[model samples]
Target chain A: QDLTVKMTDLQTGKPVGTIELSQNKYGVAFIPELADLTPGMHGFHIHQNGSCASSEKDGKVVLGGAAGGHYDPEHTNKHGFPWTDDNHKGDLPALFVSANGLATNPVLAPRLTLKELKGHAIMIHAGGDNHSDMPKALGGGGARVACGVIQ
Target chain B: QDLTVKMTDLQTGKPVGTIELSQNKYGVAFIPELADLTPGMHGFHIHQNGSCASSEKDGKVVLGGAAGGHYDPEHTNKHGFPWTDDNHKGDLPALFVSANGLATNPVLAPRLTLKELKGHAIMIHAGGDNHSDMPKALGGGGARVACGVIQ
Candidate 1:
């Protein structure tokens, strides 16, 4: 079965588009209908919480902080490539947005399954994912730009 | 005092931008540093709850439903222009996104203050708000896309 989730803007809480999540023999599939993303690749991952609320941090309220960190139930305690076993389970490949502001491409996460996705949240970062925690946390996918909750 | 709120993508639970809210002798001022929004006018308002969680709506999980309806403390039961008195206090002016995908303009709500914003959520609608519930409900500002919680 396929699950459809809505994507909204972080600043205004308005709808940007929807993403259809499905799984197959290979892995989990992410089909994006994003129509307003910046033109480039963005970091993508699944978060721990189903809530998208913002919470305070050092007196500053950060967006989507309520969703918690990447879905790492096993305490892998590392951020790496999606296909790697020592990395966080929520790690996924970067999402590409076209020059026309549309992200119609379909991406795959060979590590994920449909059953494990329920109650988790999806995230899109402002920067592309290098699949490393080297220079910055979470592959330099610095700021979160868009999000969705899986049911 | 100035209150800063982080905005996150509803689909991916990521950060997009921030909005700083402040109040003065001229009511409340909403300064937006929004990037990555569709180039047009969008509906803006204050939702009753500070949460941005997605919930089931008629069997479909809708984003930002936990914020509840407009912050209608008096139950005015109407959506109208921001400067008007007979409308929902949460109703505000539309937000304009430049062609470069920026919404840097500041808006004002003469009837509100920074204190009232606490524990409330700021929302942006996909479509422009006509300030009336006539045509398509809430002035056709459908499908909340982006959001911020006032602290």
Candidate 2:
């Protein structure tokens, strides 16, 4: 059985989202609140791996790895977002945050797995993701704005 | 030689702190802005070796994991605040924010190397760090409110 995962907004220090994770899963689905997001669709994905032990970014006590690279166990090709075939292990889909500067969409992660997510971190960016390295790599999702550990 | 580091309040979207990094060092002291950080003590440390390859964190694309850690070559320690001696490579020390939730204290990192801080992410949380995993093993700071890729 997996635990009920919940994430809090770093700014308001409030729980903004939640999800149920199980073993052997791939990723989690989400729909961020535009009121919480920085407007527009942002690139969202499960960080490679990390811990949210601390409330501060530089504070993470264990740092599962400060949320290491995106789960790329396969060490596959470095393709683009909407990951078609090739891409780095960190390629995740685009997460539209809406015009309110928040993510208010239903999220679904196909790669979420219990074994992989137990001790990991969930990250949120400041901008939108192109899902293609053409304009910018990693879907051009500028900067890591917010994050939370999947405890 | 030493490297200068900077941090921004992910919530307020402002430069909330700054620090100095050295080669083959372990800890780096940071000073947060009065506007962003509240007065209090928080955990601080150098993370593993990495590059903020992707801006995914903020507008700044951390180039050398300037934020630190993930450099766990041996990767054998447990999760903990940097101050704790028995913990992971990312562990260092606790930062003392002001009583107003503001941090302006300059810290010192002992076991890290500035040369290795090329491309990595620097994250921040919402709460304070106790350094001891007390009420919550690991001080349970809170969520990652802001982050920046090391330059």
Candidate 3:
């Protein structure tokens, strides 16, 4: 069985995006139909872990990257941008919502097994990311203001 | 700095409304910028906690009201709704989001101080509430699908 859900941003109190997830082996995908994607790649990946509640301290809601590293539960040795890997679980295909604030393309994600993707939160960042855990900044994806969970 | 955070419905994953919370002595008045309300009065109230990462099982979240009623630091009387004298310290005026789905009225809950409401959750229901504990099972507000935290 598959589920279609709509999400809201807790901060602004508005509808932020929509999600389509499956109950089978294939995982979930988030399609934020926003009308803007500047000339560059934005950081799109799953987090390690964290619950989306409001009782955070100093807005430090970062809980060990709670979303769980891109749903590749197999622990494959592949890693990097969505275009470079068939194994990197953390890699997600980039979103290219046009400058008109509309992502003309479908919000398609990489091959994450449904079993691995369930029971996790899907986050969308306000900035682009360079998917490498090697750098000092953990690939430098700043701020996770919008997010939703897979039911 | 003033912040305007928008939140969405977790069940259907649709954009719900925005809470224009301003900093002040009293607690935040989370006004939902709704577009379409699910007819009837919804159980509108804040939780005593926060730090939730998922929307599933919203009723079971950490900040659920079961932990305790609204935070009435004043140790006010834990009376029923609409009665200021016997009401819990966290009690305040009821919220009435219009039929169009926009919470046109500003909620003024004085029981909670600004600091405490930073990361709590608020929920809406499919039925109306008289703000009394008379009806068993959380004022008879069946099923919690539309919920968001105060960050």
Over B1-151, each residue of candidate 3 has an lDDT whose tens digit, in order, gives: 6656555665566767766654433334444466556633456655555532343344565323332344445555343342243555444434444435555444444334556666665666555454566664445555444556666
| lDDT minimum window of 10 residues, candidate 3 chain A | A22-31
Tens digit of lDDT per residue, candidate 2, span B1-151?
4445567565556666565444322233333343356444444434453332222346654332343443344465455533233556555434444435555433333334454555655555455444445676444555444455556
DockQ of 3: 0.01
Q: Please give the lDDT score at residue B70 for candidate 3.
A: 49
Candidate 1 backbone overlaps, count: 26
The clash count of every prediction, one per candidate, is 26, 107, 58
The two-chain DockQ for each candidate, comma-separated, is: 0.01, 0.01, 0.01
Q: Could you give the CAPRI-style class of model 1? A: incorrect
Error of 1 at B68 (Å): 0.6
Superposition error at A117 for model 2 (Å): 2.5
For residues A43-126, what per-residue lDDT tens digits would candidate 2 score against the true structure?
A: 665666665333335554422235655555667645443223345544554554433444433343433444565566676666
lDDT of 1 by residue, B89-112 (tens): 998767767668787655666668
Of the candidates shown, which would achieve the greatest lDDT relative to the real structure? 1
Candidate 3, A67: how far from true, in Å?
A: 62
- List runs of model 2 lying over 4 Å from the truth: A8-15, A19-28, A31-35, A52-65, A77-79, A88-90, A111-114, B1-151
TM of chain B vs. native, candidate 3: 0.67
